[PDB]
């Protein structure tokens, strides 16, 4: 999944952010790693509807 996220960013090498994106987007990995922080992971882009114009 990370390897996919990296191909999706025209990068040869997996970086943290890739591992995060992979995990937080897969229902089951997210749930397994529910209380885990991934160093240099960032968060999934997500802006609550009511906040948009």
């Amino acid at each position: 999944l990370a390897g996919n996220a990296a191909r999706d960013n025209k990068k040869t090498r997996i970086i943290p952010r890739h591992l995060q994106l992979a995990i937080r987007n897969d229902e089951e990995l997210n749930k397994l790693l529910g209380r885990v922080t991934i160093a240099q992971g960032g968060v999934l882009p997500n802006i609550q509807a009511v906040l948009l114009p």
């Binding site: 209380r35 922080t37 991934i38």
Partner: peptide
């Protein structure tokens, strides 16, 4: 320490 607090950290 973070593991104890239930805020596990990966990559250290």
């Amino acid at each position: 320490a973070l593991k104890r607090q239930g805020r596990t950290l990966y990559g250290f």
